[PDB]
Design a protein around this ligand. Structure first.
Ligand code: PAR
Ligand code: MG
Ligand code: MG
Ligand code: MG
Ligand code: MG
Ligand code: MG
Ligand code: MG
Ligand code: MG
Ligand code: MG
Ligand code: MG
Ligand code: MG
Ligand code: MG
Ligand code: MG
Ligand code: MG
Ligand code: MG
Ligand code: MG
Ligand code: MG
Ligand code: MG
Ligand code: MG
Ligand code: MG
Ligand code: MG
Ligand code: MG
Ligand code: MG
Ligand code: MG
Ligand code: MG
Ligand code: MG
Ligand code: MG
Ligand code: MG
Ligand code: MG
Ligand code: MG
Ligand code: MG
Ligand code: MG
Ligand code: MG
Ligand code: MG
Ligand code: MG
Ligand code: MG
Ligand code: MG
Ligand code: MG
Ligand code: MG
Ligand code: MG
Ligand code: MG
Ligand code: MG
Ligand code: MG
Ligand code: MG
Ligand code: MG
Ligand code: MG
Ligand code: MG
Ligand code: MG
Ligand code: MG
Ligand code: MG
Ligand code: MG
Ligand code: MG
Ligand code: MG
Ligand code: MG
Ligand code: MG
Ligand code: MG
Ligand code: MG
Ligand code: MG
Ligand code: MG
Lengths: 138, 125
RNA sequence: GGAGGUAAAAAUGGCAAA
RNA sequence: UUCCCGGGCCUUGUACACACCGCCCGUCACGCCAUGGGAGCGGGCUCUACCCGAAGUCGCCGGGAGCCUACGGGCAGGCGCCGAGGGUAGGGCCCGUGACUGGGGCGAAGUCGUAACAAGGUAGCUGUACCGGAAGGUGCGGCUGGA
RNA sequence: GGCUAAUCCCCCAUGUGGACCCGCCCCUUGGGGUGUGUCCAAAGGGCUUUGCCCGCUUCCGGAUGGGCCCGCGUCCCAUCAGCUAGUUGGUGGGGUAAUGGCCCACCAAGGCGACGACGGGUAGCCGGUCUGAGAGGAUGGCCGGCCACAGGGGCACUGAGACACGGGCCCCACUCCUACGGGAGGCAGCAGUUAGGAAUCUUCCGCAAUGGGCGCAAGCCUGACGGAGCGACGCCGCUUGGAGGAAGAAGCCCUUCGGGGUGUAAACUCCUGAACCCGGGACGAAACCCCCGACGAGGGGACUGACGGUACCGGGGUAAUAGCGCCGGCCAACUCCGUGCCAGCAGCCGCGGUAAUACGGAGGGCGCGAGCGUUACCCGGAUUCACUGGGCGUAAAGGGCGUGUAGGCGGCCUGGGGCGUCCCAUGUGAAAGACCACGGCUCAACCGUGGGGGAGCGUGGGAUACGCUCAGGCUAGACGGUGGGAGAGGGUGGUGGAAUUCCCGGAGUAGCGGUGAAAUGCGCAGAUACCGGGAGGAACGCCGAUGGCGAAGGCAGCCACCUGGUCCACCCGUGACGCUGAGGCGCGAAAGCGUGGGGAGCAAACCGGAUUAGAUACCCGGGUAGUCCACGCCCUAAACGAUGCGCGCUAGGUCUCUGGGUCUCCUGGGGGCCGAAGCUAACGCGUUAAGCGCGCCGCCUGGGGAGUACGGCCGCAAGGC
C-alpha cells in the first residue's frame, strides 16, 4: 500500500547496500527525484536515471561502496553507514533554523524539505529557512 | 507502542507506595507501649529480639524494635518512633529512639552513642 | 519394511550454614 | 549378561548442584497479622420532597391609626415572594465497628500422605464436569512446554 | 421637649456644558455630530487683602486602578457513562457603572457528554524553587503578582470603590458581665497564653530613615516598616595558635618478644595574639522648615538617629572549646580481647553455633568539622512508563477468530488557496531570582549596576518543497468482467457396507472372559466359539500423506440440492474507491445447562474383584448422566506457529499440493525442510523472518496474594468479562 514512499526508497537503498548490489529500483516520484539529487552531490551514490519498467517509471539508483578491505570479512565499508526516516507519517517532525541538529558533528547530512525546496542542514542555515526534517544519512 | 496509542492512552506514572504509614510521614511520633516482649526471627537466624507494641497518637497500634543491649521499657512507657524495619522480624517496621522520655540510653555504651542515645562520659580526658 | 510402538512391583530422608 | 550390587564410555531427560541419602506439593495442629462476607450498630458528606422561618433587599398597601420642613410626597408601620438555618420523611456514596465465618500471607527442626521434577515409577500440563482427608484421581476434547 | 452654626440639607435662577425621547447625517452592536422639547449645577475658608492661595460646581481629555467577556493551557479515579427546570434559546421587562437565565413572566424543546459530561478524592494558581546531560519529574515555604477568605452561615447599608478582619444587622456554637431584663466579645494583625504535636521565637525599641492616611503648614497616627532579641534551622566567614622538638619520654595497644604503633604528637623553648581593658567614634540625613528671589526656577542657612557608643579606628593585652559518624564487600579505613545462632548488628547481599577485620570494648585508621549522624519526603541513579529513550516465539506481555463504526494513516502528475509548517519586522513576555561581567560591605554569603536571550501568543508581510484542502487527470494499489481449476469449507435431504451389542432358529459342548499373575463376572436354566435371520444406534477401514480446505474453532463412506472463500489465465471495465480498526456485532473445541427425542459401543459419579501399610487411584468385571439428533443457552482452553493484520525490499538449494505457458524448463498461489546477509540473551528465525522499513490495533512494567475480593454487566445455573 506504501504508506510512506520515501522510507520505502531509503529502505530499498539500505537493503541494497548490505548485499553489495550494483543498483536498485525504486518507483518514480519528482519529490524522490529531488531527494536523490542531494544523495548524489554529497557522495552517497553514483546517480540515477528515469528508467521505465513495463511501462511504469522507476529510478535506477546506482550505489557506491568503499575499498575492499583485507584480512577477515573482506566486504568493503559502506559509504552509507546509517540511513533512516525521521519525519514519519505517524509523527511529523518540524524544525527551525535554531533547532537544526548536528548530525554526527557535521560529518553526517540532514536532509530537510524547506519552502525554498529540498535542501540540507548546511544549506538551510545559509539561506535561513528550516522545515520538515526528512532524514539523516551518515 | 505507537505514537497515536500514546496520545490516546499515554504513560502511567509509577506513584510509589509508602513503607512507613506514620500518618503524614512525620519523622517521629510519640507513643505509649502496651505489650513489650521478645520474639523469634526468620529461618536463617535464631535469637530473642526485643519488640514492643506501641499505641501511638495516631490511634493505631504497631510493633516497635528496641535497639541496643538492655532497656527500661514497661507497660506504661512513653517512647518515640523513628522508622526503618528489621529484616529478620516480619511485622516489625519501626524503631524506638533511645534516650527520649522513658527509654534510657544503652548503659555502658562507648562507641556509637549518637545512636542508642548515650551521653559523653567524662573520665578526665 | 514403513507405520503402529514394549513396566507388574515399593513410601520416605529433621533445621540452618565454606 | 535377562535379573541384584559396583564401575567405564557415548547419548537423552532434569524443577537435582552441601547433587536421589536431592528436591518438592497439599490438607491438618499452633502463633501473629491483614482482608472479604456477616444479624446489624455508630459517624461523616450529599441529594429529593415538604413544614416553619430571623435579618435584609425588592414588590403592594400606607387605610377605621401616627410623624413630617414647601403634602396627588416622604418616614414609621403592615403584607407578600425570596431567604440563613431548624424540623420531619425516604435515599445515595464513603469510613469505623460486630458474635461468627470463608479463604490468604507469614512464622528454623509438629502430624498425614507422595501429586510434580528422571517413562518420577499412571508422560505431564490444560479447559470443563463429577468425586475424594489431602496433595489429587477419573471422564470428554485439546497441547508439546513428551516418547 | 426646646434652641442653634456651617463645606449639612433643600428651592428658585444662570447655563459654557451634559443627560434623556424623537427626527436627520457620518459611522456602522449602545461611537460621533446636530435641531426642537424637558431636566440638572454649585461653598466657602486664610492671610504680607477688593490681590493671591486652599477648596467648590459642571463638562471634555490624560494618568492610574478595577469590572465583565473570549481563545488556548491547568491532578487522580471509567471499580463514576450518562447528565440537565432556570435546564438550553427567543420576546419583553427588572437590576447593575456595564453584557448576561444575573433575576422574573410567556413561548419554542432544547443544551452538554468517550475530544470523558455528571459525580467522587485532592489542591489556592503563577513568576519561581529543587533536581536533571537534556527532555522531563517533583514542588508553590521566604519574596513578588492575581484570587479566595476574617469564629460558622446569610444579608444589606454608607460610599468613587466593600457585601467590608480591628463597620452594621440576624441565626448558631462558645466565653464573659449581670440588679435576670438584656448586654459585651470574635488575635487566619504585632508580640504573648493554652491545646494539639517530633517541632517552630520577644507580651523588645523607635517613627531617625523609606512608604501610607489626614492637614496650607506646623505636626499627629502607623506592631507598615526600619532595627534589636531568641533558636547551630540553613548558608557564609572565623577561632581553639605558629615555628622549633629525641633514631624519638611516660602511659596505652600489638608482638614471630628482637621490636613496631600512637608519634614531631606531648613536655619544653621562642614568636604572634581570640577573648578581654581604655580612649575616640560614625555612613545611613537631606528634604519638609526658614531667608533672597513672587511661599516657582535657582542659591544659602538651620533642625532631626531607634539601632548605639553599636559595627569600626587607635593603644594595651591572655596559649586560649572538640566533637560526631564509620572501618566485611558496595565504600576510604585492621589488629587484640570478650561473647559463643547467646547477647547483639543490619540500607542491599547478609554476619554470630569457641580462635568474628560484620556483635561489645580497647588500640590504631579513614571521612567531615561547630558540626556529625539518623528518620521522613522530592528528583536522580531508574533507558524499571523509554517524546528524546524500552518492549511482547520460549523471561511480564499479540486480543480465540472475523466483519465493521468512529478515529489514525494513505499511490503518481499538474494547477488554486496558504490551515499545519518556515522566515523577517513589531508588541507582549512586570520586577525579583537564575546566567555573564564590574562594583559595595576588610572577603564570602548578601546586595547594587549593566548586558544577554528563551519558547508561548497577538498583528503586518513573504515563501509553497512536504502534510491539509479544492479542481482536473493517470494507472502499478484495490475492486469488477470473461473463461476455467482444485478442495474433509458450510447447511439440508436421502443413502451403502464392515463391525460391536441384543433378540430368535439350527448346530454343539465343560468351560468362557480377563491380568503383567488371578478373582469378581458369565455358563449345563445350554454360555465361549460357528451358521442363518432381524432390530437399533454410532463412527466411516483401505484411498490417507511429512496431503487438502476454512479467518479461527474446526471439517473425512456416497449421492444430490442450496452456498461461501480462493486460485490462474485473458489483460477488457471502474478508477484511489485503500490499510488498520477502540466500541459494537457474529462465529467459537470439549465439557456443561434447559426442553423433547434417541441410546449399540464407550464411559465421569457409583458398586464390586484384586494390588496395597492404606486405594476414595493406576489394572479387571458391571454401570448412570454424558457422548449422538432438533432448537435455545454457555464464551472457556496449551482457542499454540505460546509469533495480530496489511504492503514494499533483501542469496539460494531441495521435497510436495494446485493452475497456466511457445509446457527440457519458466512463472503465479499454497504446505514442509536446510540455509547468504541480517537479527537474537541463547536455543533458533531466515521471501510462510523472530531481517530491513512504514501504517494501525491489542497487550507488558518483579514474584506471591489473584484472575481472588468488592462494585458493574452478562447467564437458568455452573460461571464468564
Ligand atoms: N507458603 C505458601 C503457602 O504455604 C502453605 O503451607 C503452610 C503450611 O502448610 C506449612 O506448614 C508447614 C508444614 O507443611 C510442614 N509439614 C511442617 C512445617 N513445620 C510447617 O511449617 C510451618 O509451621 C511452623 C510452626 O509449626 C512455622 O515455624 C513455619 O514457619 C511454618 N512454615 O507452612 C506454610 C506456611 O508457612 C501451603 N504450602 C500453601 O497453601 C501455600 O504455598
Ligand atoms: Mg512422612
Ligand atoms: Mg525419595
Ligand atoms: Mg532434608
Ligand atoms: Mg542459622
Ligand atoms: Mg574408555
Ligand atoms: Mg546419563
Ligand atoms: Mg469486615
Ligand atoms: Mg400627585
Ligand atoms: Mg459493615
Ligand atoms: Mg476474619
Ligand atoms: Mg509420584
Ligand atoms: Mg506420574
Ligand atoms: Mg500424575
Ligand atoms: Mg481435566
Ligand atoms: Mg475416581
Ligand atoms: Mg450651550
Ligand atoms: Mg436649578
Ligand atoms: Mg485546601
Ligand atoms: Mg535521566
Ligand atoms: Mg479562629
Ligand atoms: Mg450605594
Ligand atoms: Mg475594615
Ligand atoms: Mg482581629
Ligand atoms: Mg505537647
Ligand atoms: Mg516614619
Ligand atoms: Mg513620612
Ligand atoms: Mg611513648
Ligand atoms: Mg549621619
Ligand atoms: Mg576498603
Ligand atoms: Mg574471638
Ligand atoms: Mg559494618
Ligand atoms: Mg568491631
Ligand atoms: Mg526517568
Ligand atoms: Mg527513587
Ligand atoms: Mg518510548
Ligand atoms: Mg524491557
Ligand atoms: Mg510468557
Ligand atoms: Mg474510516
Ligand atoms: Mg498523500
Ligand atoms: Mg498558512
Ligand atoms: Mg523577568
Ligand atoms: Mg538584575
Ligand atoms: Mg486495462
Ligand atoms: Mg482525485
Ligand atoms: Mg478489517
Ligand atoms: Mg462452545
Ligand atoms: Mg459438547
Ligand atoms: Mg442435553
Ligand atoms: Mg418439563
Ligand atoms: Mg464396559
Ligand atoms: Mg505400597
Ligand atoms: Mg472400568
Ligand atoms: Mg498448534
Ligand atoms: Mg489486530
Ligand atoms: Mg493469534
Ligand atoms: Mg514456497
Ligand atoms: Mg531452517
Ligand atoms: Mg476463570
Amino acid at each position: 500500500m506504501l504508506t510512506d514512499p520515501i522510507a520505502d526508497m531509503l529502505t530499498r537503498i539500505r537493503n541494497a547496500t548490505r548485499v553489495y548490489k550494483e543498483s536498485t529500483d525504486v518507483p518514480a516520484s519528482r519529490f524522490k527525484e529531488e531527494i536523490l539529487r542531494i544523495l548524489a552531490r554529497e557522495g552517497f551514490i553514483k546517480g540515477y536515471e528515469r528508467v521505465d519498467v513495463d511501462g511504469k517509471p522507476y529510478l535506477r539508483v546506482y550505489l557506491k561502496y568503499g575499498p575492499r578491505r583485507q584480512g577477515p570479512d573482506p566486504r568493503p565499508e559502506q559509504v552509507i553507514h546509517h540511513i533512516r526516516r525521521i519525519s514519519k507519517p505517524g509523527r511529523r517532525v518540524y524544525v527551525g533554523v535554531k533547532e537544526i541538529p548536528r548530525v554526527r558533528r557535521g560529518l553526517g547530512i540532514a536532509i530537510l524539505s524547506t519552502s525554498k525546496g529540498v535542501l540540507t542542514d548546511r544549506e538551510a542555515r545559509k539561506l535561513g529557512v528550516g522545515g520538515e526534517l526528512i532524514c539523516e544519512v551518515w | 507502542p505507537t505514537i497515536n496509542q500514546l496520545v490516546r492512552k499515554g504513560r502511567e506514572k509509577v506513584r510509589k507506595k509508602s513503607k512507613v504509614p506514620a500518618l503524614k510521614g512525620a519523622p517521629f511520633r510519640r507513643g505509649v507501649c502496651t505489650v513489650v516482649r521478645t520474639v523469634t526471627p526468620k529461618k536463617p537466624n535464631s535469637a530473642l529480639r526485643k519488640v514492643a507494641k506501641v499505641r501511638l497518637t495516631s490511634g493505631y497500634e504497631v510493633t516497635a524494635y528496641i535497639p541496643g543491649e538492655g532497656h527500661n521499657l514497661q507497660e506504661h512507657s512513653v517512647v518515640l518512633i523513628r522508622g526503618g524495619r528489621v529484616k529478620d522480624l516480619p511485622g516489625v517496621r519501626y524503631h524506638i529512639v533511645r534516650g527520649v522520655y522513658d527509654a534510657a540510653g544503652v548503659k555502658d555504651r562507648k562507641k556509637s552513642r549518637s545512636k542508642y542515645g548515650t551521653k559523653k562520659p567524662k573520665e578526665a580526658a
